[PDB]
Design a protein around this motif. Structure first.
Motif, mmCIF file in Angstrom:
data_model
loop_
_atom_site.group_PDB
_atom_site.id
_atom_site.type_symbol
_atom_site.label_atom_id
_atom_site.label_comp_id
_atom_site.label_asym_id
_atom_site.label_seq_id
_atom_site.Cartn_x
_atom_site.Cartn_y
_atom_site.Cartn_z
ATOM 1 N N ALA A 1 -13.776 49.982 32.834
ATOM 2 C CA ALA A 1 -13.005 49.036 33.635
ATOM 3 C C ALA A 1 -12.175 49.720 34.730
ATOM 4 C CB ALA A 1 -12.093 48.221 32.721
ATOM 5 N N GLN A 2 -11.956 49.007 35.831
ATOM 6 C CA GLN A 2 -11.168 49.515 36.955
ATOM 7 C C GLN A 2 -11.498 50.957 37.336
ATOM 8 O OE1 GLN A 2 -9.728 45.914 37.522
ATOM 9 N NE2 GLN A 2 -9.005 47.642 38.754
ATOM 10 N N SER A 3 -12.784 51.219 37.556
ATOM 11 C CA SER A 3 -13.253 52.557 37.910
ATOM 12 C C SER A 3 -14.418 52.510 38.895
ATOM 13 C CB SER A 3 -13.693 53.303 36.639
ATOM 14 O OG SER A 3 -14.115 54.630 36.919
ATOM 15 N N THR A 4 -14.328 53.323 39.945
ATOM 16 C CA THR A 4 -15.382 53.432 40.954
ATOM 17 C C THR A 4 -15.947 54.831 40.732
ATOM 18 O OG1 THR A 4 -14.190 52.034 42.545
ATOM 19 C CG2 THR A 4 -15.960 53.415 43.403
ATOM 20 N N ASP A 5 -17.262 54.905 40.536
ATOM 21 C CA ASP A 5 -17.927 56.175 40.230
ATOM 22 C C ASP A 5 -19.111 56.533 41.120
ATOM 23 O OD1 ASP A 5 -16.560 56.582 37.320
ATOM 24 O OD2 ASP A 5 -17.051 54.461 37.695
#
Lengths: 203, 15
Positions: A55-59
């Motif tokens: 959640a709430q993560s850009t990878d």
């Protein structure tokens, strides 16, 4: 009426040669040693990576090879229903961050990367300081399909995309003199993105 | 959530 399928000479030349070998594809695939820990390269398919549902993560994850010369083309396969709110495709220097907190178009967010947001049809580069640019340029009455091609011309210093066999035109300029890697920015849980190098032209 | 993620997962990249 008749859509235009003409493409720049060099791209025609490259696409006239046979596709790159399995060994060449693997040589230019996702690098498991240069990725966001929230992403992992599929054990049974080194060309595809998987994103944990964090959640709430850009990878992001970079390709194994940094390009400094020649025309290079690779195909990106990103299931449409697996893009979420922010899906960006592009290239970057080895210094671009591979992760950020929250959801956003990470690729193209700093001066270290250049990307095309597939959901917003916008080009980003040094996003913090620069406004996005619509692409492809609207003229009629655009959805990015599951697969499409990316074309990096390091001799001319440009990046372009080809969707549905149609050249969309130059997206970015000024890449000359850099060492750029293929990169993607994703936020969707369990998304799988496949990158298959098509070929390089030394022209 | 909206992007098909869930809070039960550990974010190894943050840690």
């Amino acid at each position: 009426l008749q859509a235009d399928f003409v493409k720049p000479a060099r791209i025609d030349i490259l696409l006239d040669m046979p596709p790159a070998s399995r060994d060449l594809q693997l040589k230019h695939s996702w690098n498991s040693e240069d990725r966001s820990l929230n992403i992992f390269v599929k054990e049974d398919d080194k060309l595809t990576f998987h994103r944990h549902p964090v959640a709430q993560s850009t990878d992001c994850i970079r390709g194994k090879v940094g390009l400094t010369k020649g025309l290079h083309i690779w195909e990106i396969y990103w299931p449409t229903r697996q893009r979420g709110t922010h899906a960006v495709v592009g290239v970057c220097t080895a210094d671009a961050p591979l992760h950020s907190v929250g959801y956003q178009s990470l690729v193209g967010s700093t001066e270290q990367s250049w990307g095309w947001d597939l959901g917003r049809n916008k080009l980003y580069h040094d996003s913090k300081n620069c406004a996005g640019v619509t692409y492809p340029a609207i003229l009629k009455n655009f959805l990015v399909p599951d697969k499409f091609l990316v074309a990096l011309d390091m001799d001319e210093g440009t990046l372009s995309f080809i969707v549905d066999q149609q050249y969309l035109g130059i997206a970015f300029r000024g890449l000359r003199g850099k060492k750029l890697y293929p990169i993607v920015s994703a936020v969707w849980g369990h998304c799988e993105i496949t990158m298959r190098y098509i070929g390089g032209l030394v022209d | 959530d909206i992007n098909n993620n869930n809070n039960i997962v550990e974010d190894v990249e943050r840690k």
